[PDB]
Design an enzyme around this catalytic site. Structure first.
Site, PDB file in Angstrom:
ATOM      1  CG  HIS A 157       1.154 -18.523 -20.877  1.00  0.00           C
ATOM      2  ND1 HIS A 157       2.164 -17.729 -21.174  1.00  0.00           N
ATOM      3  CD2 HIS A 157       1.702 -19.467 -19.769  1.00  0.00           C
ATOM      4  CE1 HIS A 157       3.193 -18.076 -20.500  1.00  0.00           C
ATOM      5  NE2 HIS A 157       2.724 -18.801 -19.565  1.00  0.00           N
ATOM      6  CD  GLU A 194      -0.500 -18.070 -15.604  1.00  0.00           C
ATOM      7  OE1 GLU A 194      -0.553 -18.798 -16.535  1.00  0.00           O
ATOM      8  OE2 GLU A 194       0.114 -18.144 -14.651  1.00  0.00           O
ATOM      9  CG  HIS A 195       2.330 -13.354 -18.580  1.00  0.00           C
ATOM     10  ND1 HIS A 195       3.791 -13.186 -18.553  1.00  0.00           N
ATOM     11  CD2 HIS A 195       2.082 -14.674 -19.021  1.00  0.00           C
ATOM     12  CE1 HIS A 195       4.508 -14.133 -18.664  1.00  0.00           C
ATOM     13  NE2 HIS A 195       3.689 -15.061 -18.989  1.00  0.00           N
ATOM     14  CD  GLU A 220       3.820  -8.912 -19.188  1.00  0.00           C
ATOM     15  OE1 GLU A 220       4.282 -10.290 -18.717  1.00  0.00           O
ATOM     16  OE2 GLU A 220       4.589  -7.999 -18.735  1.00  0.00           O
ATOM     17  CD  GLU A 265       6.805 -16.853 -19.793  1.00  0.00           C
ATOM     18  OE1 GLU A 265       6.396 -16.539 -20.738  1.00  0.00           O
ATOM     19  OE2 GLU A 265       6.644 -17.396 -18.624  1.00  0.00           O
TER      20      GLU A 265
END
Ligand SMILES: CCCCCCCCCCCCCCCCCCCC(=O)O[C@H](COC(=O)CCCCCCCCCCCCCC)COP(=O)(O)OCCN
Lengths: 53, 438
Positions: free
Chosen positions: B49, B52-53, B122, B129
């Site tokens: 994940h 993906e960022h 990030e 998140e």
């Protein structure tokens, strides 16, 4: 001995029926413990995580 | 009758699969990868994940800003999602902007910078998140459902990963993940809409030819999960709506019972008080729930993975004193898949599914998603004629036999969130998985 029989003539039958009852009731007691523990285990095993709001 | 899905391979083993529609003017091209969070271990959980960022944070050529501009200039958009078993990166564009989009996707997958400065930036975004998923109740419920059903197993982990890992993910482990997993034999280049297959194969030969092949190429959609009957309760009295999921172990993509499980799922079906037609649906559970105001909604699901699945229902309700009735009536409807279903329900569900499986694919993104999902789970696109034949093969005996081995008297995984005081303890829920009268 004879007078004891005269007072309680059911003696022999009673003690044999008592042996059968003891055996059945003991087995049922053992199984009832297994079943109680089986059914209670989700409550006994429960765990918590607390995050104060 | 839909146009045929064309399929070609490259030398490395990259599959190209396309379905043209000369009636649309847009095209969805993208890369479906047979890889996801489940490929991580406990130490690098969250990596897929995280990547993906970073995939959108700049490449060896285009910087972050140049990347933004290049896509803006294309006219369409790019999109990505990482799941437990699948990762997708796609680009919706105009017909003649397809070579640009293939080039950008090839770049962000093969040649991404993964610069320490960007990792560090990030690392905070992803940390935020973790505290905002909390609002998406359906997702909270399903992530707890996987965590408990597959307790301490890879399918049980979340996609975001723990906070601890987010703080310790390095560019090294990111690079290692995508080098081990993003291999040509695990990837499918998919085009749907206004695409020519032969054009797409040429673009694949131009951009994805220097992809590594894995050492041991297994077929696409190749995987041992041990389901745990269990419950998570997240009681929150301040929420007005209770969200409850109940599931049993379901079927994998390639199970022999895959269609039988879908038909069984359609017999219970979905319900939503906000839709006008829902009060008139044929499903027994629908009728019970609507007449008695037991729920705002319920949604039956049959989620599949390569080697397991979860089959169950997700309920939402404000009726907090009758949660017990709601759960009771739902599980008694499941009992009837074992005891009572006949040709009446089975043929009705088959009718509804024969259309439903075709109706779902109503745009280029849905078509691309269907080609990509089927190619990465089954190794082939299954034609609607084959699908119609597999559905027709489902009998009432098949449904009863499946429910008797999958549902009847089986352990469930149960998650409740919200005002769930009225949800009884595990035993009383699990006791409704059978009927003493049968
Ligand atoms: C009223 C008092 C209740 C207390 C019952 C305890 C024992 C009484 C049973 C009589 C007795 O002597 O039975 C013996 C066996 O005991 C046993 O095996 C019986 C112990 C079982 C414990 C209780 C289980 C249910 C009993 C109560 C239910 C009554 C209504 C439900 C329909 C042996 O006698 P035998 O074996 O020669 O008998 C002929 C059939 N072979």
């Amino acid at each position: 001995a004879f007078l004891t029989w005269a007072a309680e003539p059911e003696h022999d039958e009673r003690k044999k029926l008592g042996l059968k009852a003891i055996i059945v009731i003991s087995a049922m007691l053992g199984l009832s413990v297994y079943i109680k523990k089986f059914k209670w285990s989700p409550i006994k095993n429960r765990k918590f995580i607390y995050n104060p709001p | 009758v839909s146009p045929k899905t064309r399929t070609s391979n490259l030398k490395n083993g990259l599959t190209i699969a396309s379905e043209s529609n000369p009636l649309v003017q847009t095209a969805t091209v993208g890369v479906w990868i047979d890889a996801g969070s489940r490929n991580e271990n406990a130490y690098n959980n969250g990596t897929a994940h995280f990547f993906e960022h970073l995939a959108f944070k700049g490449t060896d050529k285009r910087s972050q800003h140049q990347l933004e501009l290049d896509i803006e200039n294309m006219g369409g958009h790019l999109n990505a999602y990482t799941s437990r078993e699948s990762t997708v990166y796609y680009a919706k564009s105009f017909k003649d902007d397809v070579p640009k989009s293939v080039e950008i996707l090839a770049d962000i997958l093969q040649h991404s910078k993964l610069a320490e400065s960007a990792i560090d930036r990030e690392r905070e975004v992803i940390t935020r998140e973790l505290e905002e998923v909390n609002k998406q109740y359906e997702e909270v419920v399903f992530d707890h459902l996987h965590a408990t059903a597959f307790m301490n197993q890879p399918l049980g982990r979340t996609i975001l990963g723990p906070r601890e890992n987010i703080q310790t993910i390095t560019n090294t482990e990111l690079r290692k993940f995508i080098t081990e997993n993003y291999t040509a034999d695990r990837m499918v280049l998919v085009g749907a809409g206004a695409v020519d297959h032969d054009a797409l194969v040429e673009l694949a030969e131009k951009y994805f030819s220097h992809l590594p092949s894995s050492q041991s190429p297994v077929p696409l959609g190749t995987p041992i999960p041990n389901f745990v009957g269990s419950e998570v309760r997240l009681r929150d009295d301040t929420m007005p709506v209770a969200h409850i999921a109940i599931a049993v172990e379901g079927v994998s993509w390639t199970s022999e019972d895959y269609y039988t499980a879908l038909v069984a799922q359609a017999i219970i079906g979905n319900y939503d008080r906000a839709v006008g037609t829902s009060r008139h649906q044929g499903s027994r559970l629908s009728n019970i729930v609507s007449e008695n105001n037991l729920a705002n909604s319920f949604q039956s699901f049959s989620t599949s993975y390569s080697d397991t699945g979860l089959w169950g229902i997700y309920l939402t309700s404000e009726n907090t004193t009758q949660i017990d009735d709601l759960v009771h009536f739902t599980l008694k409807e499941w009992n009837r898949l074992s005891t009572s279903v006949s040709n009446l329900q089975v043929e009705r569900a088959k009718s509804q599914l024969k259309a439903g499986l075709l109706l779902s694919l109503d745009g280029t993104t849905y078509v691309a998603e269907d080609i990509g999902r089927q190619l990465t789970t089954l190794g082939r696109r299954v034609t609607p004629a084959e699908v119609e034949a597999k559905l027709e093969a489902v009998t009432e005996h098949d449904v009863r036999a499946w429910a008797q081995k999958t549902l009847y008297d089986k352990d469930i995984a149960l998650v409740g969130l919200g005002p769930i005081e009225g949800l009884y303890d595990y035993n009383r829920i699990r006791n409704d998985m059978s009927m003493m009268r049968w």
